[PDB]
């Protein structure tokens, strides 16, 4: 219920790069929210991505997102709602790299 809206996002990946940008969550049904993402990686690559947060019966928040601006790499992971104003992003890219970030509202 707290996800919908815009979040400021900072991330770091296993290649030692960092990223900054935003994620925007749109409620769709009781079991899914749509996500769109914008930002920039520390190597200069622009970030444009879109996906879905799927909610399982145990309330786990699974995220799948594809990034056309990064050669269509895909990211799959889980969001952990630490508080009403903070969430943690743990994921792995389709290249096999860890991607960790923090969402702040
Ligand atoms: C800041 C930010 N980085 C994102 C994705 C992202 C960042 C990275 F550093 C990656 O290597 C990568 F494969 C994806 C994203 O969606 N946002 C909002």
């Amino acid at each position: 219920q707290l996800l919908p809206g815009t979040w400021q996002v900072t991330m770091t990946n296993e290649d030692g790069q960092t990223s900054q940008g935003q994620m925007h969550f749109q409620p769709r049904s009781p079991y899914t929210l749509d996500i769109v993402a914008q930002g920039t990686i520390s190597d200069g690559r622009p970030i444009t991505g879109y996906g879905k947060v799927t909610v399982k019966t145990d309330d786990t928040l699974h995220v799948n997102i594809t990034y056309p601006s990064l050669g269509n790499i895909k990211v799959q992971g889980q969001i952990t709602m630490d508080s009403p104003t903070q969430a943690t992003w743990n994921s792995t890219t389709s290249d096999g790299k860890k991607l960790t970030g923090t969402l702040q509202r």
Side-chain angles (χ1 to χ4, degrees), residues 1 3-19 21-51 53 55-58 60-73 75 77-97 99-103 105:
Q1 296 284 327
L3 259 194
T6 294
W7 299 75
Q8 306 300 315
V9 184
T10 308
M11 321 194 68
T12 312
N13 65 27
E14 186 169 350
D15 285 334
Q17 299 158 333
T18 63
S19 63
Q22 300 78 35
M23 282 181 185
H24 313 273
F25 295 90
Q26 178 72 283
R28 284 284 171 242
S29 65
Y31 61 93
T32 39
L33 301 75
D34 291 348
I35 172 179
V36 292
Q38 284 188 317
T40 314
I41 303 178
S42 60
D43 61 2
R45 277 180 297 159
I47 297 166
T48 296
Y50 65 90
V53 186
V55 192
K56 310 312 184 207
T57 51
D58 56 15
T60 52
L61 294 182
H62 298 245
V63 292
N64 289 75
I65 178 160
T66 308
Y67 295 92
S69 72
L70 306 176
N72 289 311
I73 78 139
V75 175
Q78 293 193 33
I79 299 184
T80 298
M81 292 295 316
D82 295 332
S83 78
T85 62
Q86 181 104 330
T88 309
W89 177 293
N90 290 287
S91 59
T92 308
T93 74
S94 57
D95 282 354
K97 316 272 180 61
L99 178 64
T100 307
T102 310
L103 278 57
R105 188 194 291 275

